[PDB]
Amino acid sequence: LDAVRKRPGMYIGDTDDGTGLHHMVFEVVDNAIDEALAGHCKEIIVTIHADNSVSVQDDGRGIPTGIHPEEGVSAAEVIMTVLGVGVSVVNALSQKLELVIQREGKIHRQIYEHGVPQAPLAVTGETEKTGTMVRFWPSLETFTNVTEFEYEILAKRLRELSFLNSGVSIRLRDKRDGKEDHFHY
Numbered sequence: 001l002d003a004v005r006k007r008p009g010m011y012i013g014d015t016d017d018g019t020g021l022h023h024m025v026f027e028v029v030d031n032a033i034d035e036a037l038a039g040h041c042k043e044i045i046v047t048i049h050a051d052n053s054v055s056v057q058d059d060g061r062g063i064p065t066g067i068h069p070e071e072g073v074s075a076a077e078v079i080m081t082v083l084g085v086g087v088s089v090v091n092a093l094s095q096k097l098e099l100v101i102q103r104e105g106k107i108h109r110q111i112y113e114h115g116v117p118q119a120p121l122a123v124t125g126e127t128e129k130t131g132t133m134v135r136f137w138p139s140l141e142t143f144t145n146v147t148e149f150e151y152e153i154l155a156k157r158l159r160e161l162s163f164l165n166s167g168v169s170i171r172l173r174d175k176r177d178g179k180e181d182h183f184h185y
């Protein structure tokens, strides 16, 4: 990930005018849509939190948790840390990122800071549900001037995605002012 950290703009887009900041969400959403497509209920929830973080939840199968035989860490950590630019870029450029995977009857959690895992992916509980959730706090060392998410920019893109990925439900929620949308074709 040091190649990303060296020139963030070349991977995510302009880090001063809001372009890159919003692209962070769209990259995560791309992965969440793929996950939702492979499951039964086919829904994603994008939430803008009051503290300027964003979470993306899917109801897919959960991304794989087993150890990657080459890399020697969880397959989930490989997705988050090894170079559509990929969600590893989002991770590298987030001051904090929380991953939650529900899969094979277990809840798994991991925290990253600036792309660095704070501990290995760990089982924290049992669950009947399946899916993946990522919440990320964009790094204010990287993203300047426009540091807050504009609802309308997210809504515009998610609407476009709902037509293309027809039969995937996309919910957008803003916890700052209560605004919400439900895109479903």
Ligand SMILES: Nc1nc2ccccc2[nH]1
Pocket (backbone or CB within 6 Å): 005, 113, 114, 116, 141
């Ligand atoms: N604040 C801060 N920025 C970082 C960038 C890369 C790795 C660790 C870091 N801690």
Ligand SMILES: N#Cc1ccccc1O
Pocket (backbone or CB within 6 Å): 028, 029, 031, 032, 035, 056, 057, 058, 063, 079, 087, 132, 133, 134
């Ligand atoms: N959110 C989300 C997500 C789903 C699958 C793989 C990576 C992700 O960041």
